[PDB]
Write a protein that binds this DNA or RNA. Structure first.
Ligand SMILES: [Mg+2]
Ligand SMILES: [Mg+2]
Ligand SMILES: [Mg+2]
Ligand SMILES: [Mg+2]
Ligand SMILES: [Mg+2]
Ligand SMILES: [Mg+2]
Ligand SMILES: [Mg+2]
Ligand SMILES: [Mg+2]
Ligand SMILES: [Mg+2]
Ligand SMILES: [Mg+2]
Ligand SMILES: [Mg+2]
Ligand SMILES: [Mg+2]
Ligand SMILES: [Mg+2]
Ligand SMILES: [Mg+2]
Ligand SMILES: [Mg+2]
Ligand SMILES: [Mg+2]
Ligand SMILES: [Mg+2]
Ligand SMILES: [Mg+2]
Ligand SMILES: [Mg+2]
Ligand SMILES: [Mg+2]
Ligand SMILES: [Mg+2]
Ligand SMILES: [Mg+2]
Ligand SMILES: [Mg+2]
Ligand SMILES: [Mg+2]
Ligand SMILES: [Mg+2]
Ligand SMILES: [Mg+2]
Ligand SMILES: [Mg+2]
Ligand SMILES: [Mg+2]
Ligand SMILES: [Mg+2]
Ligand SMILES: [Mg+2]
Ligand SMILES: [Mg+2]
Ligand SMILES: [Mg+2]
Ligand SMILES: [Mg+2]
Ligand SMILES: [Mg+2]
Ligand SMILES: [Mg+2]
Ligand SMILES: [Mg+2]
Ligand SMILES: [Mg+2]
Ligand SMILES: [Mg+2]
Ligand SMILES: [Mg+2]
Ligand SMILES: [Mg+2]
Ligand SMILES: [Mg+2]
Ligand SMILES: [Mg+2]
Ligand SMILES: [Mg+2]
Ligand SMILES: [Mg+2]
Ligand SMILES: [Mg+2]
Ligand SMILES: [Mg+2]
Ligand SMILES: [Mg+2]
Ligand SMILES: [Mg+2]
Ligand SMILES: [Mg+2]
Ligand SMILES: [Mg+2]
Ligand SMILES: [Mg+2]
Ligand SMILES: [Mg+2]
Ligand SMILES: [Mg+2]
Ligand SMILES: [Mg+2]
Ligand SMILES: [Mg+2]
Ligand SMILES: [Mg+2]
Ligand SMILES: [Mg+2]
Ligand SMILES: [Mg+2]
Ligand SMILES: [Mg+2]
Ligand SMILES: [Mg+2]
Ligand SMILES: [Mg+2]
Ligand SMILES: [Mg+2]
Ligand SMILES: [Mg+2]
Ligand SMILES: [Mg+2]
Ligand SMILES: [Mg+2]
Ligand SMILES: [Mg+2]
Ligand SMILES: [Mg+2]
Ligand SMILES: [Mg+2]
Ligand SMILES: [Mg+2]
Ligand SMILES: [Mg+2]
Ligand SMILES: [Mg+2]
Ligand SMILES: [Mg+2]
Ligand SMILES: [Mg+2]
Ligand SMILES: [Mg+2]
Ligand SMILES: [Mg+2]
Ligand SMILES: [Mg+2]
Ligand SMILES: [Mg+2]
Ligand SMILES: [Mg+2]
Ligand SMILES: [Mg+2]
Ligand SMILES: [Mg+2]
Ligand SMILES: [Mg+2]
Ligand SMILES: [Mg+2]
Ligand SMILES: [Mg+2]
Ligand SMILES: [Mg+2]
Ligand SMILES: [Mg+2]
Ligand SMILES: [Mg+2]
Ligand SMILES: [Mg+2]
Ligand SMILES: [Mg+2]
Ligand SMILES: [Mg+2]
Ligand SMILES: [Mg+2]
Ligand SMILES: [Mg+2]
Ligand SMILES: [Mg+2]
Ligand SMILES: [Mg+2]
Ligand SMILES: [Mg+2]
Ligand SMILES: [Mg+2]
Ligand SMILES: [Mg+2]
Ligand SMILES: [Mg+2]
Ligand SMILES: [Mg+2]
Ligand SMILES: [Mg+2]
Ligand SMILES: [Mg+2]
Ligand SMILES: [Mg+2]
Ligand SMILES: [Mg+2]
Ligand SMILES: [Mg+2]
Ligand SMILES: [Mg+2]
Ligand SMILES: [Mg+2]
Ligand SMILES: [Mg+2]
Ligand SMILES: [Mg+2]
Ligand SMILES: [Mg+2]
Ligand SMILES: [Mg+2]
Ligand SMILES: [Mg+2]
Ligand SMILES: [Mg+2]
Ligand SMILES: [Mg+2]
Ligand SMILES: [Mg+2]
Ligand SMILES: [Mg+2]
Ligand SMILES: [Mg+2]
Ligand SMILES: [Mg+2]
Ligand SMILES: [Mg+2]
Ligand SMILES: [Mg+2]
Ligand SMILES: [Mg+2]
Ligand SMILES: [Mg+2]
Lengths: 155, 386
RNA sequence: UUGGCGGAAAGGCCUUGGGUGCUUGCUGGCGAAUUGCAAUGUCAUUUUGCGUGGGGAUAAAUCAUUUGUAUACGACUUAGA
RNA sequence: GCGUUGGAUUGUUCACCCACUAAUAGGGAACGUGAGCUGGGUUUAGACCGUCGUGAGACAGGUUAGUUUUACCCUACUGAU
RNA sequence: CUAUCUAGCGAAACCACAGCCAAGGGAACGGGCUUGGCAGAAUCAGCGGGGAAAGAAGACCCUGUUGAGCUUGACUCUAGU
RNA sequence: AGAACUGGUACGGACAAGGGGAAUCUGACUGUCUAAUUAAAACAUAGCAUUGCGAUGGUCAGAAAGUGAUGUUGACGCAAU
RNA sequence: GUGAACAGCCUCUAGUUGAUAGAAUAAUGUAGAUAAGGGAAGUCGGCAAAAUAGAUCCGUAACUUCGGGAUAAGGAUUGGC
RNA sequence: GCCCUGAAAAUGGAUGGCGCUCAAGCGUGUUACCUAUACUCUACCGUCAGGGUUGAUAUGAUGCCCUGACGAGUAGGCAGGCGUGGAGGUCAGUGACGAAGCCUAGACCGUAAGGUCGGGUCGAACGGCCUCUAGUGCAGAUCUUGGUGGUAGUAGCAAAUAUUCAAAUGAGAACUUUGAAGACUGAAGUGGGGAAAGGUUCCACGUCAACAGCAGUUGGACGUGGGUUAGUCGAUCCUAAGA
RNA sequence: AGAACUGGCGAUGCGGGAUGAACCGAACGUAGAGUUAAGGUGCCGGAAUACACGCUCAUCAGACACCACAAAAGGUGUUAG
RNA sequence: GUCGAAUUUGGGUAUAGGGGCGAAAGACUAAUCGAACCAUCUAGUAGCUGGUUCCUGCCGAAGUUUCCCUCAGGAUAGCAG
RNA sequence: AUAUUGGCGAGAGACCGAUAGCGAACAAGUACAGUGAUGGAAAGAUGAAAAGAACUUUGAAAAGAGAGUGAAAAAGUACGUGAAAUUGUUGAAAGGGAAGGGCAUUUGAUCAGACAUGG
């Protein structure tokens, strides 16, 4: 309980979390925005395709020096990638959500992802040995993912 | 503080920037100065380079150690099947330059051309010029109207033509379309020639004849990203040099505090547009001819196609231009071929040439024989055969 | 609505025939206030979304796969009902 | 506008001689140019000689041997979406 | 084998604020000031012009009433003899 | 060891495996050292020369001693250059 | 096994197949090779590279402390049967 | 006099720029016009000076009131004040019906240091005024400790010839097991034991959060247990340089 | 480099000299209205493309104190003497 | 380079900081050497470098004199509160 | 009578309040380093009380989502409050080679000060 800012009807919605997850905060950040605002199945189906290297994830902030791809076009972009561990994580949380919305009795066919947000979790600290008897941090940047799915509203 | 010894600069600064050309079909940027008193005729031509080979001929150069003497010469053969007029363009002089006023297209454009206007032909409805064809439904009118317009306002007239790429060996089904300037008489007489030829065909013996110097516009073979040594002919640094030696040592003095636009740097080599001039026409090929590759001296019945076929190209079923020496671009690539922009009296350019023999051996290896006939006669009957 | 002309960016110009409103060329019959002694008053033209009633037209590009005249990656060039 | 070179001795710039040549002009750009090179000279520590000094040591004297770091940032430039 | 592109993993240096030039003046070589040239998102591979690039409070030189290693008929002493 | 026959005249067929020669400077030689910028012509050396000393002694150690090194020694010796 | 051989190369017993991986083959690299003609003209300087190389037989200079120099140099040969 | 010659230097450039030719150039003269924190008049703040005034007469006598002049500032001097921990005194001061603290392009007061208030958050203490006292105010010190960025999903994870097929187990397999193939170490070994040193790493079972710079079901990891048997192998005895 | 008197900069902003410590004008509490200084008034730019008499034509004109330089010597250019 | 000896080498033992050890480089003496390492004297001294924490109001400088192993510092007079 | 930064036993403070106070408020002369003499830290606070989340459900699990406990989960053994740097999301705006600042106003947002006069 207590997600970020939400502008949704909590009764037409179900939510999902995942904290202290070992997956590149930047990387997954980027895949999060990739579905942010999508219809749940469009997102799921597309995220699945990302594993297939059939479509990609647009890298828009954390992206200096990333290689370019033809698959960026779709989203008007030249630097994209395919962060498997990020989809794979994000997926399982898209799964929980869907599992919980159903449990809550919401119309799967109306569900869209109204909120999705990754924060930085506390760093994990490993050691690397550098030349001339020095030492340097070798760090994991864990993430906190959290998301919400919602029945789209009918006029 | 003054270079210790002088040397000339490397590279020419007027072929900048050394980038990749836009089109793969190089632009004609100039057409000969129209003499509007000769018959109407194209001024350039579309063709696909096939390969090269060797010639022999006596020389006609009084005062040369080789006058009245045999010389051998490399030649390149470009595959040039007749071209098809599918339209006309009207250009008008303006204080901002030439301007396309209208364009009038033919009623039936083949798939070869139609194809050009598509990126996924197979899954397209091929709706290309279907509603334009309706303009011909009327007695004339809409088409006659725009044809009348070019006659009134245009200051230069260009035909649209396109290769019949299907007549050639290439896998490319899509044909190349080009504008060509009409240089016959009256602006009226021009569009007339153009309307009269709609959907009809033009061959190369109606533009170029033998002994003609022609120019040859084309996009140079590509080589991708190149170091400064081979891209600029920069000198190769000593062997001892740390951090490699296919670089150049001094990218610049301290001031200007900026790498300058003229020092040599790594990057793209090849795929550049070049207009290459004064290539003399040695033989105009007739496609129907079974004696393409023969001579008034060597009379044997053979065609231009070498034994084994032109390497990496294929066979020459068609009319062809034999040009002396070489031509930009590589085998398979399109080449606009263009009449000279001037009247050369080079003597080297007035020499009428007559070949004595045309090397027709294989290029795919160290060819020994000219004709399958000759191989037989020489080697005798083999373990296959009979 | 009849003719024409305009290609420098013509996208406008002259011309023929009636139709229709206005006409301050002239002569009459009415109206106006109280918005209170100025504030505060004619609404111009851009786009853009929705509404109606009519006329109309009924495709492509990209991803992927493929060529190698191209190529560090993008890009380029081919091919596929 | 356009060229202004090949070499013997020297760490040399300089000097000088051979030779070719249309000509072998003079200079700048942090005495251009060391995250471009090289490291021969100079100018750390080893060592020999000569001169000087009682000596430790000295020399604008001769000599030999002596580790040449980093760009992935910004701009520039070259190419590329 | 790299570099290059992808999954996974993932540092460091360095950072007043920053990052296009020409002239001017100016602490006498400006990214910023003045006067001009100009000036169009976001970007990839290369590069070694420039950031007086970075890397140890200059090791040369000088100053300090600051040292230490060493030498000597400098000064003042001392184990010894 | 010798002879015949044989081959695209090859055959230490891969592997393995001294380039040579004429001189100058310089240290005789093998040997040694600046671990991490100097392997040298520097240090050493055999050889040569010089000096001191007969034990109550020469050279050296210790704050001192009924203390100690040379000395399990004695000049063909030990010590010092 | 080859061979002078505890060399190099190949194998048996025994033991490993463990050093992130996939796709491409731009530049520039690190490591390995090759070049027509010329043959040090490169350079401080042949640096780097190249050339020589086993064995049998023949042959072998100045000088020398008579021991050396000396594998001096220069040649012929080499498989299989 | 003006103009021309005399008059040659390195990025491309400077009457400031544009551009100007009976000038928008040079010499001279006449008027008008633009404009500084300066000058003139006035309001307000302060500082300084001169004066009036508690005569019985409500609320400041270090006060109220009238008048004139003045106002630059480093180093530095003095003055009047703002803010902090703790102390004496007093508002019988605020407070779980919410102290303090924190957040807030919300409000008000002061020239300012600062003060005050609303909303939010919170949860046990805390203010004002007169005085007392100092371990009393930060932007810097290549300051101290800690925490965090840009760099950057970047440099990179390229020495030691080399892997491949299938099955099995598992949520999950390039990496574990078994099978097969392909190869290496080549007895100067990637073989078999020991000395120093370690100290349980050995062995079985379970097992994967961390660790093995990809991964992991595997491990020298994690948890739990098991294991080292002597008259003859050593120590132990001996003496060595020495102590 | 170094003295004399004074005024400045340093310590000082404001207006002018494009720019600039030091020139010119003028020194500063918060403000309104007026007027000016030095300097300006074609356009950038607030303000007469004002008035008046001459001078000057440069295939290198010239354009404002400090100030961002020019000299000897020449000219049948042209002006006045 | 050298590779059967001035050979390489394990363990035990000995030498300790103005001391050792040195086939001699000021070399080595635990990544430390022209005097090791560890604590204390020690908050060693610094005419030198760096920093030095709130607001406003008033006044407001000196770089000059004399003396000083004085010349990057003091005393002294002046200027200032 | 005098001394007493050691030992035992006590009474105190205008001292400090977890980067302060002894180095140590804690399994502190501990963990760790070093051949050795020596060097030597970090680290206190859920709640009145574990009432430490039964049970259902998605998952391989860790966890999530319900539910439940509690005065509070805006206290979940990561735990009082929970600032700053720095970060995600949402919303508003601007952006031709920095940004930020001063005087002035347009435009948008926001906020005010006013109150009492017969029915
Ligand atoms: Mg969380
Ligand atoms: Mg970024
Ligand atoms: Mg980049
Ligand atoms: Mg890269
Ligand atoms: Mg490392
Ligand atoms: Mg180490
Ligand atoms: Mg030079
Ligand atoms: Mg020159
Ligand atoms: Mg060009
Ligand atoms: Mg090249
Ligand atoms: Mg070439
Ligand atoms: Mg080198
Ligand atoms: Mg270069
Ligand atoms: Mg070069
Ligand atoms: Mg050709
Ligand atoms: Mg060929
Ligand atoms: Mg127009
Ligand atoms: Mg009005
Ligand atoms: Mg190709
Ligand atoms: Mg020369
Ligand atoms: Mg020559
Ligand atoms: Mg100079
Ligand atoms: Mg220089
Ligand atoms: Mg440089
Ligand atoms: Mg260098
Ligand atoms: Mg040198
Ligand atoms: Mg030396
Ligand atoms: Mg030297
Ligand atoms: Mg050497
Ligand atoms: Mg580089
Ligand atoms: Mg560019
Ligand atoms: Mg990657
Ligand atoms: Mg200028
Ligand atoms: Mg200036
Ligand atoms: Mg100056
Ligand atoms: Mg200069
Ligand atoms: Mg500049
Ligand atoms: Mg700068
Ligand atoms: Mg300024
Ligand atoms: Mg891009
Ligand atoms: Mg490049
Ligand atoms: Mg640079
Ligand atoms: Mg840098
Ligand atoms: Mg210094
Ligand atoms: Mg002194
Ligand atoms: Mg002295
Ligand atoms: Mg010393
Ligand atoms: Mg004496
Ligand atoms: Mg020797
Ligand atoms: Mg020997
Ligand atoms: Mg050394
Ligand atoms: Mg040696
Ligand atoms: Mg053996
Ligand atoms: Mg091997
Ligand atoms: Mg083993
Ligand atoms: Mg590795
Ligand atoms: Mg060669
Ligand atoms: Mg030769
Ligand atoms: Mg040379
Ligand atoms: Mg040379
Ligand atoms: Mg030479
Ligand atoms: Mg060599
Ligand atoms: Mg060879
Ligand atoms: Mg034989
Ligand atoms: Mg010059
Ligand atoms: Mg210039
Ligand atoms: Mg003048
Ligand atoms: Mg005038
Ligand atoms: Mg005047
Ligand atoms: Mg004023
Ligand atoms: Mg003042
Ligand atoms: Mg106070
Ligand atoms: Mg207080
Ligand atoms: Mg206190
Ligand atoms: Mg009181
Ligand atoms: Mg409160
Ligand atoms: Mg409490
Ligand atoms: Mg007080
Ligand atoms: Mg305190
Ligand atoms: Mg303090
Ligand atoms: Mg601070
Ligand atoms: Mg700071
Ligand atoms: Mg400060
Ligand atoms: Mg990553
Ligand atoms: Mg990378
Ligand atoms: Mg590396
Ligand atoms: Mg593997
Ligand atoms: Mg093997
Ligand atoms: Mg072996
Ligand atoms: Mg196990
Ligand atoms: Mg790992
Ligand atoms: Mg793992
Ligand atoms: Mg046990
Ligand atoms: Mg026994
Ligand atoms: Mg002044
Ligand atoms: Mg000063
Ligand atoms: Mg002033
Ligand atoms: Mg000026
Ligand atoms: Mg301007
Ligand atoms: Mg004006
Ligand atoms: Mg005018
Ligand atoms: Mg003057
Ligand atoms: Mg005159
Ligand atoms: Mg000592
Ligand atoms: Mg020495
Ligand atoms: Mg150490
Ligand atoms: Mg050492
Ligand atoms: Mg102190
Ligand atoms: Mg004053
Ligand atoms: Mg005086
Ligand atoms: Mg004295
Ligand atoms: Mg000083
Ligand atoms: Mg503490
Ligand atoms: Mg502590
Ligand atoms: Mg608590
Ligand atoms: Mg806490
Ligand atoms: Mg609460
Ligand atoms: Mg709480
Ligand atoms: Mg819990
Ligand atoms: Mg908390």
């Amino acid at each position: 309980a207590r997600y970020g800012a939400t502008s949704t009807n909590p009764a037409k919605s179900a939510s999902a979390r995942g904290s202290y997850l070992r997956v590149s905060f930047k990387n997954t950040r980027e895949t999060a925005q990739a579905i942010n605002g999508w219809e749940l199945t469009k997102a799921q189906k597309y995220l699945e395709q990302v594993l297939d290297h059939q479509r990609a994830i647009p890298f828009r902030r954390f992206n200096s020096s990333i290689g370019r791809t033809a698959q960026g076009k779709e989203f008007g972009v030249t630097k994209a990638r395919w962060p498997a561990k990020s989809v794979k994580f994000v997926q399982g949380l898209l799964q929980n959500a869907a599992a919980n919305a159903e449990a809550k009795g919401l119309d799967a066919t109306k569900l869209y992802v109204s909120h999705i947000q990754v924060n930085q979790a506390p760093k994990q600290r490993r050691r690397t040995y550098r030349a001339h008897g020095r030492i340097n941090k070798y760090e994991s940047s864990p993430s906190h993912i959290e998301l919400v799915v919602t029945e789209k509203e009918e006029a | 503080s003054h270079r210790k010894y002088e040397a000339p600069r490397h590279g020419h600064l007027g072929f900048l920037p050394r980038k990749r050309a836009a089109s793969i079909r190089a632009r004609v940027k100039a057409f000969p100065k129209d003499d509007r008193s000769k018959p109407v005729a194209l001024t350039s031509f579309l063709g696909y380079k096939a390969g090269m080979t060797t010639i022999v001929r006596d020389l006609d150069r009084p005062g040369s150690k080789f006058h009245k003497r045999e010389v051998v010469e490399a030649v390149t053969v470009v595959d040039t099947p007749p071209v098809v007029v599918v339209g006309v363009v009207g250009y008008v002089e303006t204080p901002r330059g030439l301007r396309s006023l209208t364009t009038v297209w033919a009623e039936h454009l083949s798939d070869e051309v139609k194809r050009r206007f598509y990126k996924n032909w197979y899954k397209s409805k091929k709706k290309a010029f279907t509603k334009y064809s309706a303009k011909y439904a009327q007695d004339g009118a809409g088409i006659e109207r725009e044809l009348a317009r070019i006659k009134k306002y245009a200051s230069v007239v260009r035909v649209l033509v396109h290769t019949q790429i299907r007549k050639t060996p290439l896998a490319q089904k899509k044909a190349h379309l080009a504008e060509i300037q009409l240089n016959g008489g009256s602006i009226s007489e021009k569009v007339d020639w153009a309307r009269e030829h709609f959907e009809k065909t033009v061959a190369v013996d109606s533009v170029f004849e033998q002994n003609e110097m022609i120019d040859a516009i084309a996009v140079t073979k590509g080589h991708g990203f190149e170091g400064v040594t081979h891209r600029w002919g920069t000198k190769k640094l000593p062997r001892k040099t740390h951090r490699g030696l296919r670089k150049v040592a001094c990218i610049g003095a301290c001031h200007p505090a900026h790498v300058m636009w003229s020092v040599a740097r790594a990057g793209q080599r090849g795929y550049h547009s070049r207009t290459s001039i004064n290539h003399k026409i040695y033989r105009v090929g007739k496609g129907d001819d079974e004696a393409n590759g023969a001579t008034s001296f060597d009379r044997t019945k053979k065609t231009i196609t070498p034994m084994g076929g032109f390497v990496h190209y294929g066979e020459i079923k068609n009319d062809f231009i034999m040009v002396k020496g070489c031509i930009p671009g590589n085998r398979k690539r399109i080449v606009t071929l263009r009449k000279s922009l001037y009247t050369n009296t080079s003597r080297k350019a007035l020499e009428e040439v007559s070949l004595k023999w045309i090397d027709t051996a294989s290029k795919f290896g160290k060819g020994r024989f000219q004709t399958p006939a000759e191989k037989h006669a020489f080697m005798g009957t083999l373990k296959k055969d009979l």
